[PDB]
């Protein structure tokens, strides 16, 4: 049995309305009895039980033991260590795992939108770019929206560790040049810890 502790969604920690969770999952269970134990050590305080309820989403033969942990926004954003102590009737000893946010002083991202390259206009679908750089930690959230509606046709490159110790990434929206020609205004919305309201967006037009 190998244990994998996972962090909460970047959006989930930034907006007070969402519930950020910490996930403790396991793969490859030993053949014997499923006697498992969990000791969630939250850097001092301890919940122990939490909500370890493995909702066995059985498909074919797969089904793992997941253990989510409701996290208090600030506690995660302040560098608390969330440890998961997984055990089982088969493992020689209990395997522990610990997660926290990327330790370091936060830096506010700078967002710049870039219109389609004049060479791309020769094509039917021009692409709008959004440069988000100089931020830290990496945990960020970028979305695109036109007229107050999310645009699903866009991809975002993972954070690249720049020379300055900070991070940077690019989000590319793909829109029909017909729409771009109409002078529509698109917006690059970015959410990040060190931003004024954990939110900021930049528009593009013709």
């Amino acid at each position: 049995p190998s244990v994998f502790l996972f962090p909460p969604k970047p959006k989930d920690t930034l907006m007070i309305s969402r519930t950020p969770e910490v996930t403790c999952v396991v793969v490859d269970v030993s053949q014997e009895d499923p006697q498992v134990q969990f000791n969630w050590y939250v850097d001092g305080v301890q919940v122990h039980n939490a909500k370890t309820k493995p909702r066995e989403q059985q498909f074919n033969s797969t089904y793992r033991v997941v253990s989510v942990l409701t996290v208090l926004h600030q506690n995660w954003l302040d560098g608390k260590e969330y440890k998961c102590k997984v055990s089982n009737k088969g493992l020689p000893s209990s395997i522990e795992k610990t997660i926290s946010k990327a330790k370091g002083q936060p830096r506010e991202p700078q967002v710049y939108t870039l219109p389609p390259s004049q060479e791309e206009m020769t094509k039917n679908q021009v692409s709008l770019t959004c440069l988000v750089k100089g931020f830290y930690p990496s945990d960020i959230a970028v979305e695109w929206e036109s007229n107050g509606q999310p645009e699903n046709n866009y991809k975002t490159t993972p954070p690249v560790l720049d020379s300055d110790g900070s991070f940077f990434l690019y989000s590319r929206l793909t829109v029909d040049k017909s729409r771009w020609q109409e002078g529509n205004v698109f917006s690059c919305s970015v959410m990040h810890e060190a931003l004024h309201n954990h939110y900021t967006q930049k528009s593009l037009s013709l």
Partner: antibody
Framework: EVQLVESGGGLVQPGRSLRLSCVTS????????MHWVRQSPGKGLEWVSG????????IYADSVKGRFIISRDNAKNSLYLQMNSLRVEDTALYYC????????????????WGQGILVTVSS | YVLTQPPSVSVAPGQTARITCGGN??????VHWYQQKPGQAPVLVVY???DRPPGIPERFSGSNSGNTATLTISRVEAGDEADYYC???????????FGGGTKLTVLG
């Protein structure tokens, strides 16, 4: 596209009551604190009340405290305003508003406004 | 809290209309601006001091520091004729205070 549609009532005799409603569309209601802002027929806007996403934090205007009762229903994407103990001074166009804040204590700004329903209080 | 903005402001087309929103230590708060056209619900033209919502024209600039917040409209046009309100959330008492409103009369 985001649209806030209000209903409520209209003309009413002082002392009587009215329950306003605001059904929202175009965004996740659960994520935003809704507010009611009225506009006195002829001069300026006046903030009336507001309620957090989880209903946890309810707040009212001093010139409304005790009378009006603001409510919300995430499951139904609806915002209400139980106007109890009406008064002629309350005659105004009531607007529904959507804020846009994620930080614990934000300086609210009304991102989206409804067309505004009218309540007339008189004998 | 108290906000104070001039009743009216008359500027001929082309000129820049600067609407002043007075406030005691308003620089510690983030002013917001709304545009209310006759018989139309107000619209957010500027928020958090200088930010503009998608679609609002570039000529709409926000300013705020010390005891004054100044909405500036470059190349004022007839379509910009309406009432402008400066709002601010008073953190000290949980109340949203709006200014009296200013009438941008594009001179004709």
């Amino acid at each position: 596209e985001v649209q806030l549609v209000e209903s409520g009532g209209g003309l009413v005799q002082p002392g009587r009551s009215l329950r306003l409603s605001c059904v929202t569309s175009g965004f996740t209601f659960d994520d935003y604190a809704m507010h009611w802002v009225r506009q006195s027929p002829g001069k300026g806007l006046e903030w009336v009340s507001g309620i957090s996403w989880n209903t946890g934090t309810i707040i009212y205007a001093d010139s409304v405290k005790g009378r009006f009762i603001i409510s919300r229903d995430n499951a139904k994407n609806s915002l209400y305003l139980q106007m109890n103990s009406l008064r002629v001074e309350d005659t105004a166009l009531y607007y529904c508003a959507k804020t846009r804040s994620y930080v614990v204590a934000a300086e609210y700004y009304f991102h989206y406004w409804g067309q505004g329903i009218l309540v007339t209080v008189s004998s | 809290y108290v906000l104070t903005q001039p009743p009216s402001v008359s500027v001929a087309p082309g000129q820049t209309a600067r609407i002043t929103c007075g406030g005691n230590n308003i620089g510690s708060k983030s002013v917001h601006w709304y545009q209310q056209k006759p018989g139309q619900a107000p619209v957010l033209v500027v928020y958090d001091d200088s930010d503009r919502p998608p679609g609002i024209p570039e000529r709409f600039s926000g300013s705020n520091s010390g005891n004054t917040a100044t909405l500036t409209i470059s190349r004022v046009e007839a379509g910009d004729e309406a009432d402008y309100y400066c709002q601010v959330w008073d953190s000290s008492s949980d109340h949203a205070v709006f200014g009296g409103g200013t009438k941008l009369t594009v001179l004709g």
